[PDB]
Amino acid sequence: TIQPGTGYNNGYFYSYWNDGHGGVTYTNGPGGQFSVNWSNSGNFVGGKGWQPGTKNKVINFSGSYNPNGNSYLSVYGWSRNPLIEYFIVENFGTYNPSTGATKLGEVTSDGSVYDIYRTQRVNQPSIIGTATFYQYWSVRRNHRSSGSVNTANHFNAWAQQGLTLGTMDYQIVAVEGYFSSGSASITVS
Incomplete structure (x- = not known):
């Protein structure tokens, strides 16, 4: 594993964060590749991409994603002003993150068709400190672990x-986990 934090690896920005509970390892591989292995983890998020992102990026990804429990695979990021955390969810484990959310x-x-949702985090950690902010979701109906995401289609629909x-x-x-187990190997471009 590598140390939690952010940086660059083989031309790609990466972010790896965990809650310190244990049970998760994250590695950066060649090009846009990263791997995650977890067993009775806490909460974590890790993956590769860009800093900053753009509103018209076509993101390609390929590999394997085998969660056992609560986990997501998504295009994941933030905006500032307004502060927003967003997810284009391509696959997930035992929990659909839109459960109970307003469509x-x-x-x-x-x-695939995606269902769009908005949720709110109240006084939670964020890229600018503790804050209340909205989250935007596109949840893919047809689950997969390779493909291409035309982000503009989502951002425009939102x-x-x-x-x-x-x-x-x-x-x-990003592979996100919440107190679960699994493995994943993903290459981004």
Whole structure:
């Protein structure tokens, strides 16, 4: 594993964060590749991409994703002003992150319909400190672990629905886990 933090590896920005509980390892590989292995973890997020992201990036990803429990695979990032955490969820484990959330529409992109949702985090950690902020979700109906994400289709659909993004901060393909187990090997471009 590598040390939790952010940086660059083989031309790609990476972010790896965990809650210190244990049970997760993250490694950076050649090019845009990263691997995650976890067993009875806490909460963590790790992956590779760009800092800053853009609003018209076509993100390609390929590999394997084998969660056993609560985990997501998504295009993941933030905006500032307004502060927003966003997820284009391509696959997940035992928990659909939109469970109980308000549905804000649908968008068809890259071979599937996605359902759009908005949620709110209240006094939670963020890229600017503790804050209350919205989260935007596109949840893919047809789960997969390779493909291409035309981010503009999502960001445009969100904007149409009144879900405004500010200036982009980082933008990665991320494996997120919450007290679960699994393995993943993903290459980004």
